[PDB]
Amino acid sequence: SVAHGLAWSYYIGYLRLILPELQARIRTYNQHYGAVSQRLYILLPLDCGVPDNLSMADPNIRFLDKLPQQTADRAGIKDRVYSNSIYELLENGQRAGTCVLEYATPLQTLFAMSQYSQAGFSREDRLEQAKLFCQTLEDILADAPESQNNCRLIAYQEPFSLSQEVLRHLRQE
Amino acid sequence: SVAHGLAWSYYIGYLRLILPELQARIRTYNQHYNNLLRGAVSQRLYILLPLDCGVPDNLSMADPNIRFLDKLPQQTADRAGIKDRVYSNSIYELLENGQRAGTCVLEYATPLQTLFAMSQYSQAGFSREDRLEQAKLFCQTLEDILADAPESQNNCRLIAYQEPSFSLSQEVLRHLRQ
Numbered sequence: 153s154v155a156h157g158l159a160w161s162y163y164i165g166y167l168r169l170i171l172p173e174l175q176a177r178i179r180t181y182n183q184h185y186g187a188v189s190q191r192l193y194i195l196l197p198l199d200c201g202v203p204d205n206l207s208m209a210d211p212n213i214r215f216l217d218k219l220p221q222q223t224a225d226r227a228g229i230k231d232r233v234y235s236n237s238i239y240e241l242l243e244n245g246q247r248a249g250t251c252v253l254e255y256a257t258p259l260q261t262l263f264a265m266s267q268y269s270q271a272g273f274s275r276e277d278r279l280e281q282a283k284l285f286c287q288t289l290e291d292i293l294a295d296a297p298e299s300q301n302n303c304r305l306i307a308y309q310e311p312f313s314l315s316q317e318v319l320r321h322l323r324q325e
Numbered sequence: 326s327v328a329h330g331l332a333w334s335y336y337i338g339y340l341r342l343i344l345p346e347l348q349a350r351i352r353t354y355n356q357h358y359n360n361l362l363r364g365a366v367s368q369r370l371y372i373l374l375p376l377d378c379g380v381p382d383n384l385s386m387a388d389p390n391i392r393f394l395d396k397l398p399q400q401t402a403d404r405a406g407i408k409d410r411v412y413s414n415s416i417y418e419l420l421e422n423g424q425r426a427g428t429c430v431l432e433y434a435t436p437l438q439t440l441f442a443m444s445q446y447s448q449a450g451f452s453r454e455d456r457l458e459q460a461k462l463f464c465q466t467l468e469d470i471l472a473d474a475p476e477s478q479n480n481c482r483l484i485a486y487q488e489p490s491f492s493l494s495q496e497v498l499r500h501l502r503q
């Protein structure tokens with residue numbers, strides 16, 4: 153299926169390559185400077201809405217800083233750069249958490265495919281595929297311990313506070 | 326279909342975002358960063374599509390006649406919560422009989438490695454013998470998508486190949502020369 157392949161590709165092509173190096177980047181950041189929490193918090197909106205700016209989705213999510221970049225030679229790209237961003241999570245005007253956060257970009261592929269006729273992908277099948285992307289990613293991570301411990305999957309449907317969604321996960325350690 | 330979705334994702338999640346900005350980066354390199362005496366880096370991103378799904382990280386290892394020249398100026402864009410997400414791309418010189426025959430921006434289409442890994446892992450439910458058919462479908466779907474994205478189609482060239490002694494530099498040069 154479309155979503156099964158996308159979850160495998162997001163793991164093989166991205167998570168497998170950044171998650172074993174994330175802990176050291178967060179520690180380096182924290183040693184230089186409350187501490188940024190460990191783990192990459194991966195946003196998984198089941199509606200497949202992937203905005204580029206997080207403060208726009210929720211003003212209680214405020215950009216703090218970029219984590220020091222990771223570079224690696226990848227598929228002929230010398231020093232391919234992996235950038236990740238750190239956000240503060242506010243609750244009633246107070247800082248309640250600080251974490252590395254981003255959306256799983258393959259969910260945007262499902263959104264685009266449901267818009268373009270040539271993709272042969274209907275909007276009516278998009279939610280089932282979004283759920284299958286999340287489930288497959290959870291299944292893969294259950295067999296990759298170092299990656300599983302370095303990320304947290306944040307799946308949600310809006311009928312909303314995105315910061316409260318992230319904080320609930322951050323608060324379960 | 327695994328490869329159909331991967332081609333759509335490689336276009337939507339990568340090529341659509343870098344190809345409209347590539348021409349300016351190559352021009353900037355040629356005007357201000359290229360060695361004054363060398364020939365101009367060719368336009369277009371040359372995308373390697375090995376149908377065996379073998380994606381090495383170092384190109385000079387695949388063929389010594391492919392030599393790393395320089396990294397293009399990086400492109401940055403806010404992407405999915407990543408502020409100033411960085412897109413880096415590499416320039417290579419292609420040698421023929423010890424002399425420089427071409428210079429271009431070159432990389433492998435990384436989703437072909439996903440097909441390779443899926444064909445290896447039991448949990449991927451992707452049989453070993455399905456690799457080639459999926460690789461061909463990935464290439465065909467990507468060609469189909471690009472045929473409807475004019476700026477992108479003119480900013481890249483798809484280099485699909487099967488190995489039987491093979492020369493990857495000759496494969497790239499044949500495309501560069503057309």
Ligand SMILES: COc1cc2sc(C(=O)CCC(=O)O)cc2cc1OCCOc1c(OC)cc2sc(C(=O)CCC(=O)O)cc2c1F
Binds near residue numbers: 158232404407410436
């Ligand atoms: C190879 O497969 C994937 C690689 C990456 S790298 C990547 C990220 O860096 C996250 C941030 C971003 O999407 O820009 C996400 C994915 C997803 C992947 O699986 C879905 C396939 O569609 C996508 C894709 O779908 C969203 C995104 C990208 S970004 C990208 C590159 O930067 C090229 C070099 C490299 O692969 O490291 C390639 C793809 C891409 F192929």
